[PDB]
UniProtKB/Swiss-Prot annotation:
It catalyses: L-seryl-[protein] + ATP = O-phospho-L-seryl-[protein] + ADP + H(+); L-threonyl-[protein] + ATP = O-phospho-L-threonyl-[protein] + ADP + H(+). The chain holds residues 3 to 329 of 391 of the full protein. GO terms for cellular component: cytosol; nucleoplasm; nucleus; plasma membrane; PML body; protein kinase CK2 complex; Sin3-type complex. One of its GO terms (biological process) is protein stabilization. Expressed in gastric carcinoma tissue and the expression gradually increases with the progression of the carcinoma (at protein level). Belongs to the protein kinase superfamily. Ser/Thr protein kinase family. CK2 subfamily. Residues 37-322 form the Protein kinase domain. It is an enzyme of class 2 (transferase). This is Casein kinase II subunit alpha. Keywords: Apoptosis, ATP-binding, Biological rhythms, Cell cycle, Disease variant, Intellectual disability, Kinase, Nucleotide-binding, Nucleus, Phosphoprotein, Serine/threonine-protein kinase, Transcription, Transcription regulation, Transferase, Wnt signaling pathway.
């Protein structure tokens, strides 16, 4: 069967924590008062929740209310525990309250407001400097949550809120986040299609924090090459083919061999044989100002099939690509 894997960093953070830290099912929710909030407008509705711009009538501050759909109400204690554990961390959204919705009784999470847009609205219009700057800010959030024993598992541009005017960023939507426990097999149906790492696509369950680093690499490729999304798969199988057309098939097969991964027989008739491509192939006159040897070297060290071979968030922060960012 599959060869086991463990994170190369922050491996045992949860083993040394009291059970209260990671045993979310044991957590007692000290519920707040639904009447303290006034809903202004619907910011959007996904398949798992509804988000609203709101006002806390007890202190007159603008908040954001996220009401969980009956389906996604099951692991509310997990999201609460993770949000409470990470509260005050750099670039992490701050959970202000947890209330029950009045008409549906489903839990509603209350967050501090973020004044400007979604990162997907901005990330295709940024300068080279701003790409570097905002990548570094995301890395601060990822290193913090990984250091706290938590994998985000849904890193994507829609989950990064950017206040471009104040040059501030928040990583949001911790609904898929999970505690890392070495040796645990996790559900591979996490992250959005275009940001899923190859470990999810080949059904390798013993993944770790490095999944978020693949997703961040997809975001970086999209930004520096002005190609959204960078890996445009039609479904989860074609997603792996899109990746293999760039990274090649030799390294994919070396990866499945290393971990004794059983490849779905449907991949034999669609993967084919592909050459490991040079990142300069995606460089054109309209994006050349966003590309540098440092950007390509950094991207190359994120987008690796082998999850153990990717840069960690702290190693990524050390990369020369960020030397030009004021710290
Ligand atoms: C006193 O004023 C309020 N205070 C709140 C505090 C939290 C909150 F969730 C809603 C309110 C709230 C209010 O006006 O709520 C009105 C609606 C807001 C939406 N809910 C839930 C809708 N049903 S649902 O199944 O929970 C759902 C459907 C679709 C997406 C996500 C969840 C029904 C009542």
């Amino acid at each position: 069967g599959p060869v086991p894997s463990r994170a190369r960093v922050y491996t045992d953070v949860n083993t040394h924590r009291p059970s209260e830290y990671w045993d979310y099912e044991s957590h007692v929710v000290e519920w707040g008062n639904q009447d303290d909030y006034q809903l202004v407008r619907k910011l959007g509705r996904g398949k798992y929740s509804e988000v609203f711009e709101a006002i806390n009538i007890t202190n007159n501050e603008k908040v954001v209310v996220k009401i969980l759909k009956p389906v996604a109400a099951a692991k509310i204690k997990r999201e609460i525990k993770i949000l409470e554990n990470l509260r005050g961390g750099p670039n992490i959204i701050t959970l202000a309250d947890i209330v029950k919705d009045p008409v549906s009784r489903t839990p509603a999470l209350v967050f501090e407001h973020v004044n400007n847009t979604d990162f997907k609205q901005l990330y295709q219009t940024l300068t080279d400097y701003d790409i570097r700057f905002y990548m570094y800010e995301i890395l601060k959030a990822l290193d913090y949550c990984h250091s706290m024993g938590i994998m985000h598992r849904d890193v994507k541009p829609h989950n990064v809120m950017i206040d471009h005017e104040h040059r501030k960023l928040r990583l949001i939507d911790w609904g898929l986040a999970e505690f890392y426990h070495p040796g645990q097999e996790y559900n591979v149906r996490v992250a959005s299609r275009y940001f899923k790492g190859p470990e999810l696509l080949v059904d390798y369950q013993m993944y770790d924090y490095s999944l978020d680093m693949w997703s961040l690499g997809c975001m970086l490729a999209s930004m520096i090459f002005r190609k959204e999304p960078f890996f445009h798969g039609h479904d989860n199988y074609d997603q792996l083919v899109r990746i293999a057309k760039v990274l090649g098939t030799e390294d994919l097969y070396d990866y499945i061999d290393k971990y004794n991964i059983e490849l779905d027989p449907r991949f034999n008739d669609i993967l084919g044989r592909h050459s490991r491509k040079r990142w300069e192939r995606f460089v054109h006159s309209e994006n050349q100002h966003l590309v540098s040897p440092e950007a390509l070297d950094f991207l190359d060290k994120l987008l690796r099939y082998d999850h153990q071979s990717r840069l960690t968030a702290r190693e990524a922060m050390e990369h020369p690509y960020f030397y030009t960012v004021v710290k």
